[PDB]
Ligand binder design. Structure first.
Ligand SMILES: C/C(=C\Cc1c(O)c(Cl)c(C)c(C=O)c1O)CC/C=C(\C)[C@H](C)O
Ligand SMILES: C/C(=C\Cc1c(O)c(Cl)c(C)c(C=O)c1O)CC/C=C(\C)[C@H](C)O
Ligand SMILES: [Fe+3]
Ligand SMILES: [Fe+3]
Ligand SMILES: [Fe+3]
Ligand SMILES: [Fe+3]
Ligand SMILES: [O-]
Ligand SMILES: [O-]
Lengths: 266, 265
């Protein structure tokens, strides 16, 4: 269908159409949407992959070290579970889950560009992750819109974590791939916790008007609940878990410059 | 069957030796869909410098071109096919950079500020994947020397850092610079097409590479000329797209909706 041809290609600008384009939520993201079956991802589960040497271990300790600081500073520990404290958590953390796949994608892109070699499907995997995690932010910001302290600390988090991820990937992209491996091992835990807690009525959900952004992106029928939204977000993290653990492994074996195994499922 | 059982496995390393190399996976699934006789009337345009920033973006490129052409010897002697491919190989390394840094910075901005991005990221990201496909194509038709492989490495560094600070200081200027660059590219890519029609240039690569034939949806009959003709249209999509995006900045419209994402749907 698209009416994009040479009369449009010889234009100077389309600045003028800008005021008459609708803001339909589906545009927020590309069409590489994830498609999960609620009854199948329902049985997603908590795994843990053994660290192989020093770098796998450094990686695993840092994620533990961070889970522990975060969990304590943020008071997630004592008090009952709450809607408020779940989404506030997911909101802040989702800002930093978006970074990794954009540094890997972006650097593997640049490498492809300077030794003029073929990437074999790695770049388009990482950037859909980055995107897919950015859409995790976009959903929770429909649910809780935070205030000035939490926002200022999100900005300093990105400054710090952009710098670490960036310079970690240049020196050991296995490290960073291992690190998201384990990062997501914790993401999966935290979310099955939230579903379990709904199922045992300890956190019975108030936000069931699932946002339009999330309905389009996960193709969810109108009658979907917070628990159904959460699960799918948890299913996404199990994928990333396997992808960054498969990617780390591949490096360990010196298979960086080999086909991205997840291209086949497509 | 991509479900829990696959998501609950730890690693898919054992699958690497059983997955085959396919040209269709070297990019995403967002491919140019051109029809040759339509895109034969792409054309050289020039946007008016609207103000001090544009004038600076334009005068940078014009000097980059003058310098590069006297230093590369483009104009010295006759057009040859080695001289065209040499050049476009060099330059198409540089060209993949801008969309990526742009795409990245905007991604980053939606995360820290928690704001809709409204279609820019992807367009700016497939824009980088496109230029890299041009590049993967040109690596098939020539494999450059050691001298040039070094010249290409160091030039990434200067250019990467340049756009990094440029896009943080002023995205208006970058998009314009990019818009202007892609005027010049269409000029070159028409000089070439015209050189073929005249017989001043007789390509020998009128076997077009596999990567390119499924990236662009061409036939095994299509030639060098036809390849230069789908690429040129890519360079004119980035010409408009980018001059529009930079008009959106000049007007404080850089957080409205990217208009092209309707111009598809
Ligand atoms: C391992 C951690 C939390 C588990 C966890 C979650 O519980 C959730 Cl809910 C998500 C989304 C993720 C996403 O990765 C996630 O990693 C602590 C990470 C702390 C930092 C990175 C510091 C503050 O910079
Ligand atoms: C020669 C130049 C421009 C013409 C031109 C072309 O002739 C071509 Cl063939 C293309 C593809 C493009 C793509 O954008 C292109 O811009 C100068 C480019 C900049 C440098 C060399 C240094 C890094 O600053
Ligand atoms: Fe994650
Ligand atoms: Fe996430
Ligand atoms: Fe190009
Ligand atoms: Fe270009
Ligand atoms: O996440
Ligand atoms: O280019």
């Amino acid at each position: 269908t698209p009416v994009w041809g040479h009369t449009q290609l010889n234009r100077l600008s389309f600045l003028e159409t800008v005021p008459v384009v609708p803001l339909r939520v589906s545009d927020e993201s590309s069409e590489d949407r994830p498609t999960w079956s609620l009854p199948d991802i329902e049985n997603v589960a908590i795994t843990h992959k053994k660290p192989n040497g020093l770098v796998d271990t450094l990686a695993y300790r840092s994620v533990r070290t961070c889970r522990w600081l975060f969990d304590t500073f943020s008071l997630y520990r004592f008090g009952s579970i709450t809607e408020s404290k779940v989404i506030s958590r997911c909101l802040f953390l989702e800002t930093v889950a978006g970074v990794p796949g954009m540094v890997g994608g972006m650097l593997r892109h640049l490498s492809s560009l300077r030794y003029m070699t073929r990437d074999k499907g790695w770049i388009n995997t990482l950037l859909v992750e980055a995107e897919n995690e950015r859409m995790h932010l976009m959903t929770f910001i429909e649910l809780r819109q935070p205030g000035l302290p939490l926002r200022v600390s999100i900005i300093i988090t990105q400054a710090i974590m952009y710098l670490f991820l960036l310079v970690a990937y240049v020196i050991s992209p296995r490290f960073v791939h291992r690190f998201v491996g384990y990062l997501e091992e914790e993401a999966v835990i935290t979310y099955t916790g939230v579903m379990r807690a709904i199922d045992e009525g300890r956190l019975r959900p108030t936000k069931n008007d699932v946002p339009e952004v999330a309905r389009v992106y996960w193709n969810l029928s109108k009658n979907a609940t917070f628990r159904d939204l959460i699960n799918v977000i948890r299913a996404d993290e199990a994928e990333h878990r396997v992808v960054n653990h498969t990617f780390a492994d591949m490096h360990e074996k010196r298979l960086q410059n080999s086909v991205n195994p997840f291209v086949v499922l497509k």
